[PDB]
Amino acid sequence: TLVHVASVEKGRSYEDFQKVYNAIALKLREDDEYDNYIGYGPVLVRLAWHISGTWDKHDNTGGSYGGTYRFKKEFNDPSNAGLQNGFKFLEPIHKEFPWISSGDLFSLGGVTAVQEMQGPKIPWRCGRVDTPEDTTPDNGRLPDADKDAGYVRTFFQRLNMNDREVVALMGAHALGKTHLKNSGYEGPGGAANNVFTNEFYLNLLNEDWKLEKNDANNEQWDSKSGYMMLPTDYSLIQDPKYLSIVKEYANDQDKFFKDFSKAFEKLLEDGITFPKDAPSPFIFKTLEEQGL
Numbered sequence: 298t299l300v301h302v303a304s305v306e307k308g309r310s311y312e313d314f315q316k317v318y319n320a321i322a323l324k325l326r327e328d329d330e331y332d333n334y335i336g337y338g339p340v341l342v343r344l345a346w347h348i349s350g351t352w353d354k355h356d357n358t359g360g361s362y363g364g365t366y367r368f369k370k371e372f373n374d375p376s377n378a379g380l381q382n383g384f385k386f387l388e389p390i391h392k393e394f395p396w397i398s399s400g401d402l403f404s405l406g407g408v409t410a411v412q413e414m415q416g417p418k419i420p421w422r423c424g425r426v427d428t429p430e431d432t433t434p435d436n437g438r439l440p441d442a443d444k445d446a447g448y449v450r451t452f453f454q455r456l457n458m459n460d461r462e463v464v465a466l467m468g469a470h471a472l473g474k475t476h477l478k479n480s481g482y483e484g485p486g487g488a489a490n491n492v493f494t495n496e497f498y499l500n501l502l503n504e505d506w507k508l509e510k511n512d513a514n515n516e517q518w519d520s521k522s523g524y525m526m527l528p529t530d531y532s533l534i535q536d537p538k539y540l541s542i543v544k545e546y547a548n549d550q551d552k553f554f555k556d557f558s559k560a561f562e563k564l565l566e567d568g569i570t571f572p573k574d575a576p577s578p579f580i581f582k583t584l585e586e587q588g589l
């Protein structure tokens with residue numbers, strides 16, 4: 298059982314959310330130093346994902362709606378190690394705009410990072426509502442990295458994501474890096490790692506990969522170029538259905554952009570029931586299109 302109705306923060310409209318977007322964008326541009334000049338984009342995208350990937354379609358627990366990331370249990374999920382940097386980034390934003398709900402902020406963080414790293418436009422809907430600490434999902438709902446194509450397919454079923462949606466979402470691994478201290482994995486995925494492109498499929502197909510044990514004793518695929526791939530990233534080219542989708546995004550950047558946009562909003566809106574007269578989704582202007 299369990300229904301979560303989108304309630305619009307009172308009196309709020311498009312241009313209020315545009316200003317929250319603009320603050321995020323502005324600080325993305327300003328704290329350009331973090332994670333050796335990668336900046337905060339990647340970790341905000343991942344935050345926006347980890348707050349949504351707790352969802353379970355079966356009983357409708359977890360997901361982005363309740364902002365339950367603010368509570369110690371989920372905050373200290375070992376799957377979330379590193380994500381405290383994104384939370385702290387969003388901290389002065391929440392103080393400047395305390396009317397916005399936690400859910401809405403975390404997911405807007407991701408949308409803003411993507412668009413500002415030159416990725417697709419992702420429509421976004423407000424309306425998530427903080428729920429209480431006892432609504433916080435337990436740890437272990439987010440996927441393991443050490444597993445195969447079969448594990449991946451099964452995992453994302455619980456998020457109601459198909460082959461195509463999964464391959465699309467995964468191309469976000471073009472962004473940022475694994476960090477040994479955070480996940481037991483080390484290295485970037487490509488050369489353009491704070492620009493949102495389809496470089497993750499290009500690298501899967503084009504680099505020369507070798508399975509190795511890393512310094513945390515974990516297996517990961519490394520290339521002569523110094524890029525890496527998680528066994529789970531790598532399964533996308535071992536499975537015949539996934540491979541064929543990898544080659545399609547490798548050859549069609551527009552296509553990748555559109556499917557990633559669809560599946561990213563679907564990820565962030567899983568679990569949430571929008572009333573028939575909720576506002577339409579907002580497509581925010583980037584700093585650049587506002588000349589800001």
Ligand code: HEM
Pocket residue numbers: 339340342343346378379440441442443449466467469470472473474475476477478479480481482527529
């Ligand atoms: C089986 C599926 C997935 C696995 C196992 C996985 C696992 C990981 C791991 C272990 C890291 C490195 C954490 C660290 O050491 O800092 C990472 C980074 C990241 N993930 Fe995923 N991920 C998955 C799917 C996704 C999806 C669906 C998205 C978004 C659409 C995403 C977005 C990101 C981003 C942007 C980073 C880099 C963040 C940074 O540089 O700090 N991942 N992922």
Ligand SMILES: CC1N[C@@H](C)O[C@@H]1C
Pocket residue numbers: 469470471472473474475484485486487497525526527530
């Ligand atoms: C988890 C990731 N895989 C590589 C491709 O870069 C991402 C950070």
